Every structure is written in structure tokens, then in C-alpha cells.
Amino acid sequence: XXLLXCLXCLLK
Amino acid sequence: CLXCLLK
Amino acid sequence: XXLLXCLXCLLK
Amino acid sequence: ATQGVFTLPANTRFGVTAFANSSGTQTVNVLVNNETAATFSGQSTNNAVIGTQVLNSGSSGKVQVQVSVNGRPSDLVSAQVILTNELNFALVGSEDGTDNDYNDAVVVINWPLG
Amino acid sequence: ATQGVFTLPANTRFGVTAFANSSGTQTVNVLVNNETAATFSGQSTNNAVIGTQVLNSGSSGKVQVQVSVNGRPSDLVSAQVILTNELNFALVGSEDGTDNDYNDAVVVINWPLG
């Protein structure tokens, strides 16, 4: 879901 | 109820 | 209001 | 989670009413825009109305209910309920002790009025 | 669907309180086991408490709220809400006219008490 979603998705 | 008895 | 009811009212 | 905080429609008249069910004297503070707008106080173990008042939700609409007994903040539980998409209740219960009946002070906020 | 009828735990004391927001005089009847247990009446457009009482839900637990204005039954909306699996509210709104604000008589029933 954008740069936001990707980070969240990656780290969690 | 017969209608229901067919459920 | 009984023993307990008195203690109640008394202490608080 | 935070309890006792409700966002009403701004600049709106609402009713706030408090009942007591405790041996401790209840102190109910109603905050509007984070400043005290009403304070009720009283003791009862038979659901006596210790206060009722009409207030205005102000520019923010933020209404907070706080309950203490002898200086000690009570544990709060709350919810808001809407009936037929119009009639609003903000509900608060509080526990001043250990029996966990959460009725020691009960606060009902309703709107609209009139 | 039926509105204003609640099944309380049997033989339990509960508080019932009514507010008025209407030019019409509200009559609030509270039935327990299909018999009238309490009757409130008053007129206000500013959320005045026109009645508050403690009643007993009786052997059936069946409590019904009926609202009328000059004998004309009002349309009811209702629900029951439970907080932390303990504190119970039964809520009634009513409409006596055409504006559909459903605040003309507002009734709050709460339990447990004490």
C-alpha cells in the first residue's frame, strides 16, 4: 500500500 | 407447520 | 443497614 | 483504552445525569473542551440521582466524564449507542472498589434535546 | 419489531428514569409482569427528569416501557447495552410527533444497583 504499506508489511 | 416440517 | 451497612457508612 | 471521552456534535445541547450505587461519596466531573463544566457529588446505594444538568458540547464537541471517590480515580467503562440513526446515549460506569459491579457512579449523557 | 420490552434477571432491583423533550406532556408507564409498576408524567423541552424510581423485575424479569402523550401512544425505539459483562442499560426513545427526534420521552433503565 505505497511506501507506507511496504515498510509496515516488510517489518511486521 | 407442515411447510416447516419440510425444512 | 445491618453490621456491614454500618461499617460501610462508618468507614467511608 | 481511554474511557469516558465522547465526541458530540459541536455546539450542541446535551443532558448529563449521574446515579450513585456505593457506600463511598461519588464525585462526577464533566469536562467540555478539556475544562470542567459540571461537577456532581453525592452518596447512595439505591441509585439516587446525584446530579442532572444541560450543557453545551462547545466548539470541539469533546465531552469527558471523570469519576473519583475521596480523591481516588474510579475505573471507567463507557460506550455510545445510537437509536434509529438519531437518538444518542453516551454511557459510563465506574468502579471505586473490588466487587466490580461498575455501578458505583453511573453517568448517562443523551442528545439531542428539545 | 417489538420495542420497549426487556428481560431482566428475575427478582432484581433496577432503576428507571425518564426525561422529557417535547411540548407535549409525557406519560411513561413501566410494567412488570404485565402489571403497571410505575407511572411518570411531566412536560419539559429541556431534558427534565419527570420520574425516577427503583423497581423489582419480579419472577418473570419482564419489564415493559410504554409512552403516551394525552393518551396517544408514542412510537418507541429501544436497545440493551452491557458494559464489561456486568453493567446493564436498557434504553428507550419515543416520538410523539412528526420531527422524528425520538427524544420526546427518553427512558433509561439500569442494573445492578447497590
Add this chain to the structure above:
Amino acid sequence: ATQGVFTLPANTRFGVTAFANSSGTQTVNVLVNNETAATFSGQSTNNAVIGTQVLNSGSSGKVQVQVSVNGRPSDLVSAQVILTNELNFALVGSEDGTDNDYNDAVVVINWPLG
């Protein structure tokens, strides 16, 4: 009173989910700004999810649930509850028959999402 109509915050994504508890095939229509936005249709006597979907409340924010079985409109009951001044549920029950369990189609709307 009117049931199954909720005013959401405008332009807000929300979930809608429908469960079935009836011999009859349930049809759930979700309307947004008075137009059909979603339609679920399924049959179960064991609470099966017959549809779930994320919709947009639109510029008006007005969301309406309608239920029917074989062209016959179901009687609706509804309410909205808000938890910790943030989490919203709009709840619908429906009765397609005479036993009045009002679970024949059950519709849950929740927001916010994400």
C-alpha cells in the same frame, strides 16, 4: 421508526458483512446515497457469511441496509455502537418469518478500516 439507515462520516471506507440463519435464501442490498452499492445473496441455517465487501460511504455518508427473501421485505432492527470513541459498529437484524429470532439475515457494518 426507521431501521437499517446509518449516517457514516462522508467518503469513508467501511466494511459490510452478512450472515444467514434461515431456510430461506437471503438477499442483502447495501445502498449508498440511495443507490444499490452491494448485493449479497446466500442461504444457511448455521451463520454462514453470505457476503463481505468494503464500500465507500459517499458524499452523503448515508448507508442503508435492506433485506428480502423471495421478494418479501424482512422486518429490520438496528443500532449503532461506538467503542472508545473511535470504533464503530452498525448492526442489523432481520426476521423473514414468524418465530421472531431476527437472525435470518444479520448484517455488520464496521469502520474505520486500515
Add this chain to the structure above:
Amino acid sequence: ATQGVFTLPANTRFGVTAFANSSGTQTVNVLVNNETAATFSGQSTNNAVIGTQVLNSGSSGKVQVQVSVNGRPSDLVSAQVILTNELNFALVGSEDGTDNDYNDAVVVINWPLG
């Protein structure tokens, strides 16, 4: 106060359904009689149904919802709502982080079924 604990009517079938709105994977545990009866898991930021199941409330009727994310328990909010004195919803929100939208796992319990 305790949240996520509901006393259902005993030996009663109920629906339990969980939705997810979070970058973190949600684990939802449903205890009956203080023992795990179902566990749901899944990740979604779009309100996906991560689990739905019918269970029996058992001899005690005690149902508890627990939510965690990678083993970290979430903060819970909850309430029970009853429509037309018949249709029940037990509702849970949960927060796994710092933004406090309390939708990260949303859990809906409904009864009666059938």
C-alpha cells in the same frame, strides 16, 4: 476493567467472526469455559475475514476473546448489545500499536443462530 469476556446463555451455539485492519498478523483466540475453542489468524489492511466459526457456549457460558500480534497481547475494548430483546452481539476491538484505531482485529460474536 476486563474486556473481551461475555456470559452467554449456556449450551448455546454462537457465531464468532474476526476481521483484520493492520500491517501485523492478527491472532484471535476464543476461549470457552477458560479453554481455547477456536484460534483465528490472518493479515489484512482491508477488513478481510480472518476467521469465522460456530461454537457452543458450554455449561458455564463464559466466552473470552484474546487478541495478540506476534505474541504481543493487544489492548481490547468490548461491549454487548441486544436488539428487540432477542438478537445479541458481543463486540471486540483491539489495538496492536500506537495510532489507536482499535480496529486491528475486530471480533463479532452473534446469537442465537439457526
